[PDB]
Amino acid sequence: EGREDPQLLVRVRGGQLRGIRLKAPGGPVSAFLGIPFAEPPVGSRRFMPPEPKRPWSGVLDATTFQNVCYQYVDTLYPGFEGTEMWNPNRELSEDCLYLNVWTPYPRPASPTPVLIWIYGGGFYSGAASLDVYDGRFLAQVEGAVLVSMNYRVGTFGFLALPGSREAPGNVGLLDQRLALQWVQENIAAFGGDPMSVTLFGESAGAASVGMHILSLPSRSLFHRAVLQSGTPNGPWATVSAGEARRRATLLARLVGCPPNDTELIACLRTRPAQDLVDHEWHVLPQESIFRFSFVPVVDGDFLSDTPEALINTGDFQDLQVLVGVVKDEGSYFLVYGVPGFSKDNESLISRAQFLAGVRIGVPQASDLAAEAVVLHYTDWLHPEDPTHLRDAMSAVVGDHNVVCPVAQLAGRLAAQGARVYAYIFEHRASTLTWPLWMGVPHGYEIEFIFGLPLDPSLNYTTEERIFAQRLMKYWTNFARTGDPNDPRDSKSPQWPPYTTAAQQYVSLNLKPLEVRRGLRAQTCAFWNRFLPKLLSAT
Amino acid sequence: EDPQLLVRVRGGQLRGIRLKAPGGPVSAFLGIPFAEPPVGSRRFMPPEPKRPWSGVLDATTFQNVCYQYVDTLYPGFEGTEMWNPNRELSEDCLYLNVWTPYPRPASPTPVLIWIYGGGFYSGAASLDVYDGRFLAQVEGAVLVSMNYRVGTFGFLALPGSREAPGNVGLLDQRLALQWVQENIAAFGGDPMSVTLFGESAGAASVGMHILSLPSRSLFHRAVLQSGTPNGPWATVSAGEARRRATLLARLVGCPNDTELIACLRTRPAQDLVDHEWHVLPQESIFRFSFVPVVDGDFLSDTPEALINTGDFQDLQVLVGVVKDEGSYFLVYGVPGFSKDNESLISRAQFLAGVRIGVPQASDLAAEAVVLHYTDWLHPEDPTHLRDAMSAVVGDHNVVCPVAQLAGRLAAQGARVYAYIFEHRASTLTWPLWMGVPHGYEIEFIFGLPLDPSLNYTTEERIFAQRLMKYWTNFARTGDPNDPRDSKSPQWPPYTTAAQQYVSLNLKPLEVRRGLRAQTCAFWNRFLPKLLSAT
Ligand SMILES: Nc1ccc2c(c1)c(-c1ccccc1)[n+](CCCCCc1cnnn1CCNc1c3c(nc4ccccc14)CCCC3)c1cc(N)ccc21
Numbered sequence A: 001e002g003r004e005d006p007q008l009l010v011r012v013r014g015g016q017l018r019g020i021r022l023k024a025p026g027g028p029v030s031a032f033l034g035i036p037f038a039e040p041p042v043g044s045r046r047f048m049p050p051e052p053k054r055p056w057s058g059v060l061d062a063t064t065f066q067n068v069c070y071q072y073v074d075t076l077y078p079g080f081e082g083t084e085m086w087n088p089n090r091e092l093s094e095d096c097l098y099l100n101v102w103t104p105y106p107r108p109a110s111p112t113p114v115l116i117w118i119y120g121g122g123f124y125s126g127a128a129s130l131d132v133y134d135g136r137f138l139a140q141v142e143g144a145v146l147v148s149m150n151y152r153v154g155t156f157g158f159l160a161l162p163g164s165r166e167a168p169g170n171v172g173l174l175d176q177r178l179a180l181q182w183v184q185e186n187i188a189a190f191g192g193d194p195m196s197v198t199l200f201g202e203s204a205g206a207a208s209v210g211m212h213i214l215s216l217p218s219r220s221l222f223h224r225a226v227l228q229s230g231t232p233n234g235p236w237a238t239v240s241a242g243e244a245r246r247r248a249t250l251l252a253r254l255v256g257c258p259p260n261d262t263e264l265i266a267c268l269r270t271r272p273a274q275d276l277v278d279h280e281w282h283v284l285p286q287e288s289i290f291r292f293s294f295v296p297v298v299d300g301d302f303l304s305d306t307p308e309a310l311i312n313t314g315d316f317q318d319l320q321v322l323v324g325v326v327k328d329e330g331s332y333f334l335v336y337g338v339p340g341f342s343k344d345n346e347s348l349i350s351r352a353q354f355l356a357g358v359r360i361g362v363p364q365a366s367d368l369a370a371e372a373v374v375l376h377y378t379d380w381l382h383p384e385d386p387t388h389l390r391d392a393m394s395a396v397v398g399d400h401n402v403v404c405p406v407a408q409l410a411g412r413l414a415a416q417g418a419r420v421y422a423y424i425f426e427h428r429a430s431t432l433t434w435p436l437w438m439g440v441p442h443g444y445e446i447e448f449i450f451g452l453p454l455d456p457s458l459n460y461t462t463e464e465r466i467f468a469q470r471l472m473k474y475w476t477n478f479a480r481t482g483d484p485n486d487p488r489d490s491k492s493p494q495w496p497p498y499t500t501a502a503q504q505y506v507s508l509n510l511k512p513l514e515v516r517r518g519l520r521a522q523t524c525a526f527w528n529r530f531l532p533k534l535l536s537a538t
Numbered sequence B: 001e002d003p004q005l006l007v008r009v010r011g012g013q014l015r016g017i018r019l020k021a022p023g024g025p026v027s028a029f030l031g032i033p034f035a036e037p038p039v040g041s042r043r044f045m046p047p048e049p050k051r052p053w054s055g056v057l058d059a060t061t062f063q064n065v066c067y068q069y070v071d072t073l074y075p076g077f078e079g080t081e082m083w084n085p086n087r088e089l090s091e092d093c094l095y096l097n098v099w100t101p102y103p104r105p106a107s108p109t110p111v112l113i114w115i116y117g118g119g120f121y122s123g124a125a126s127l128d129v130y131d132g133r134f135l136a137q138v139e140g141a142v143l144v145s146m147n148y149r150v151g152t153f154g155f156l157a158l159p160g161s162r163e164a165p166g167n168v169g170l171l172d173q174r175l176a177l178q179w180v181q182e183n184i185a186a187f188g189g190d191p192m193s194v195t196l197f198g199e200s201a202g203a204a205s206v207g208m209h210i211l212s213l214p215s216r217s218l219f220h221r222a223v224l225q226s227g228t229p230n231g232p233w234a235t236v237s238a239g240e241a242r243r244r245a246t247l248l249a250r251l252v253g254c255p256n257d258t259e260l261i262a263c264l265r266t267r268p269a270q271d272l273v274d275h276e277w278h279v280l281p282q283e284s285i286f287r288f289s290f291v292p293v294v295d296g297d298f299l300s301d302t303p304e305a306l307i308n309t310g311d312f313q314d315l316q317v318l319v320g321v322v323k324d325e326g327s328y329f330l331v332y333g334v335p336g337f338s339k340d341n342e343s344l345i346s347r348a349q350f351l352a353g354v355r356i357g358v359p360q361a362s363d364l365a366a367e368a369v370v371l372h373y374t375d376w377l378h379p380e381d382p383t384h385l386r387d388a389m390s391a392v393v394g395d396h397n398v399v400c401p402v403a404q405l406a407g408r409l410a411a412q413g414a415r416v417y418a419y420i421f422e423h424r425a426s427t428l429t430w431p432l433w434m435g436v437p438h439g440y441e442i443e444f445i446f447g448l449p450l451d452p453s454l455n456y457t458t459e460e461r462i463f464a465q466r467l468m469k470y471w472t473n474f475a476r477t478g479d480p481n482d483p484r485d486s487k488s489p490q491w492p493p494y495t496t497a498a499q500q501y502v503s504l505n506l507k508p509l510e511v512r513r514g515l516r517a518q519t520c521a522f523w524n525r526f527l528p529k530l531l532s533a534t
């Protein structure tokens, strides 16, 4: 110390850090990357709840992103930006419990609202180090303090033998909770306001945010929440204790650890990380899409009951939530698992391929339930039209997994005292490499919220730059006040809260805010009210 | 005498009456006997042909109306009383009426045979709405309408017995069709061009003549207005007809089929009418006690089996519905409904209504109906719930059976033309909420707005004339389009692919596609699976 930039030296509970001065389009930002928030969850600590990071000596170098949690790397389309933008961009390691902080440069004078990002990737993948999660634009343009953490995914984060002490499950959610506790204790050192913390996430990250709303020890660590294209309720975000036990026992057998829980988990702990990753997909009970093997478990601890029970009986009076979906939630999910679909052709499918797709897309559905889906989604005026069947297949997967769980969440939260704001993101990035038929796929609003179009080198349009700026203002005004609307602006139309009566939501596209009523009201009544009765009475 | 009013039919001489229609005279031959009176020992028995007569038979007045239940729900109310018997009630009722141009046609003229509705428990060919004088005068048509036995008298069956075989009301209709073949040439009608047309139970009757081979040689074309042979109310199984006939016998104190039917034959007609409604298996609406039975004789199989397996090539069919098929049916049986208020109902009253409106439905099937018909944007809105209740009853009973019929007929070689009648008569005394109720297109097809004394608008007179042209163009050629009108829009045939139908209102023909395609997929494809697997 002495010749360094005095504005990049900060102390936290565990010791001294040295950050880096990053260039954002409009000026510098301070970034503290790869801060350890936990003891590496390696060896005997595998499958175990995280432990806080013991203090270190000297100045920890926080200028680069740290290891990405051990996960399956997507090699389906080599060289393809469409798939590779989501791939790990740092070394894979079980030693991965690190977080990143972006703040204005110089650090804020007065306490600043904090935004905490929780990434998606079906609870089997993802990293806080990805380019689309770059906090520099929100920090520079909006003066925000942005935090993102790495949390354990796959078997490492969610393999559970419920009731055991060695593998209790939900440890990836505990890693997220420990980063939330780290923020409470240390964010003031960066100029962050611990009394104004907004959680935001997409897909499995939004489901994670939802589970922090539904778990009491997490409630004291944040004040507001954003759930983008994901919810704690729904068919993929959780599993029962029985199903988690079945999947963990099957994976153990597949890697030569046959079953006492102590003996089984000890053997799993001896397995190389790649062995567990090589078999993680082999434990799913059916041929399915939008289903992940190791996800949060209804343990009766982190989740005292199913998210459906918790959202229906909870008092959400003290909560402000921003929720929404993209135009084509299911389109991407069709390219791996449904025969007839490809990113390289127009995916015009037959009726037979549609019926078959419905079985893969709704794996838990009986023959009667699958017929009810088919009959509801068929255009009886053009029942064999390949374009309609292709679009219906995308809608089945999007509605079942995202849109209707989101409508169910917004509805219950609003009925139970929360301030809810809902949107539909309909803008397709001019730079998108997925086919046009895929529309606005799952995750393609993220680069807009984070302000990536503000970087001139990324080649987005001027209109896309103005729209990203509008979006950053909605998200940060929501983080600041619990309302996305700017108080010093009446010209711009307003975003009304979502209510059970009016069911108002807004369209997020290049045009000004447009207020719409009912988020697939008829279709989601099918999924949320009828279909459970068909998967119950018969 | 007037030679234009003197006709010799196979049974003897008749004398008609010259009637005044707005545009000029018409010849009417009313109350022609086509069968031996089905009285005494002939009660419940198939009709027998009328024996010949001496002298000139007086055919100047309508004859007796078949014994039936008279509607007294709203006394003095035109809305209900227009459908009530307008002649004396008698079991001696097997008579038909003929209207022809005056003077009698020079060349053989296409024949239109009207079969009235009234849930197979009521109706008469003598009602003012069925007046053939306008079609005869304006279009030069030969119009025939017969009385057929309704209620227990027409459809009480002890299947397998010889004394009460069932479907005798359909046999009465068939005997009038045979009478037309043998005698219509004497009036200037063409027996080689006979179109059956009917509404509600009359349209279901027309449908059953399409599905029964001995009837097929008696007509060439058919019009089914707001009714079909398929569907939940038009037929009953042999087991259910036997159950209902046994229960009715019990209710009138009647203790072997021969012995039971003999006792029923001793009962005054009113005793049978007094208990006919008390044999229905549930609290229901749009359900009638004594209707055609699947006997394995007149109906060789269920109308659903027959429509799915039949060859309908060399057949032309005109089918359609009114805008608000179910609205009227809510006024009797559904709590919360009245003709005297706006009938704004609660959600509870809607769920309860769905049970009465779909009586065969399980708890799951009723929930599926409720969830499909609820507007999840306004689920408690009384106006939406009222309109949804009307749509449930209209769709279940009429619109979706019509869509199922049009589809199967078209797929199996018939030439089908479909419509939706959306014009509400300026003279309607039913509330506005009821829209265009079941049966209120009939006065337009028959040309009643052409009578200046009936106070319809000028636009309604022009529209009735358009409708009479569609119906008679269809009777003449099997195509309702005007070969004269070299200007469109043309009425396209209904196909399984394109599903084209037309709107019949004051505006020019408008071609639409899919007759409640999504909703009728629910009723015709999904709901049977919910009452089959569970
Ligand atoms: N060897 C083997 C054995 C069996 C199976 C598989 C591989 C794979 C596989 C194939 C290619 C790449 C990755 C996994 N999948 C397909 C899994 C499909 C899930 C895709 C998904 C769901 N959430 N994140 N991802 C992948 C991460 N990438 C994305 C992410 C997001 N959006 C995206 C939009 C387009 C393209 C990728 C996106 C938003 C959230 C961040 C992650 C399976 C699916 C099933 N159901 C069963 C077995 C396998």
Ligand SMILES: Nc1ccc2c(c1)c(-c1ccccc1)[n+](CCCCCc1cnnn1CCNc1c3c(nc4ccccc14)CCCC3)c1cc(N)ccc21
Pocket: B069, B070, B071, B072, B073, B079, B080, B083, B117, B118, B119, B122, B123, B199, B200, B201, B277, B278, B280, B283, B284, B285, B286, B287, B328, B332, B333, B437, B438, B439, B440
């Ligand atoms: N005493 C007693 C005991 C139990 C029950 C009943 C009476 C009555 C009843 C009440 C008034 C008049 C006749 C019957 N109904 C209601 C049945 C009403 C059937 C409605 C119907 C169906 N087809 N014809 N009609 C009556 C005739 N009138 C009409 C007709 C048509 N359209 C109409 C439009 C508006 C009003 C009346 C119309 C077109 C075809 C001609 C007949 C019951 C209904 C049920 N489901 C169960 C028991 C009874």
Ligand SMILES: *[C@@H]1O[C@H](CO)[C@@H](O)[C@H](O)[C@H]1NC(C)=O
Pocket: A339, A340, A341, A342, A345, A346, A347, A348, A349
């Ligand atoms: C698209 O490509 C896939 C894989 O090659 C194939 O299954 C599908 O039939 C193709 N569809 C079209 C429309 O060419």
Ligand SMILES: *[C@@H]1O[C@H](CO)[C@@H](O)[C@H](O)[C@H]1NC(C)=O
Pocket: A457, A458, A459
């Ligand atoms: C931007 O466009 C230029 C062409 O002018 C191209 O060379 C560069 O690779 C593009 N970069 C991105 C990120 O699209």
Ligand SMILES: *[C@@H]1O[C@H](CO)[C@@H](O)[C@H](O)[C@H]1NC(C)=O
Pocket: B336, B337, B338, B341, B342, B343, B344, B345
């Ligand atoms: C309509 O009137 C009947 C009785 O005449 C009643 O049961 C019903 O509640 C009334 N509805 C309204 C909207 O007042």
